[PDB]
Amino acid sequence: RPAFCLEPPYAGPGAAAIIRYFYNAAAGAAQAFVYGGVRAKRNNFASAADALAACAAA
Structure with a gap:
């Protein structure tokens, strides 16, 4: 599991x-x-699907 998969979600400052x-x-x-x-x-x-393939590969 790449380390970045543990980051909280980040909205950013955009509107x-x-x-x-x-x-x-x-x-x-x-x-x-x-x-x-x-x-x-x-x-x-x-x-x-994209999120799972990068972070829950198995």
Whole structure:
């Protein structure tokens, strides 16, 4: 599990309201969050599927 998969989700300072996905390692699940459209961190994906493939590979 890459270390970045343990980051809390990071909205950033942007004013957009974009639906993105992060890997919630405690929950064992990819979950939606609101991304502001700028200053993304790595635990930020287009889909649940993308998040799982990077962070819950098995």
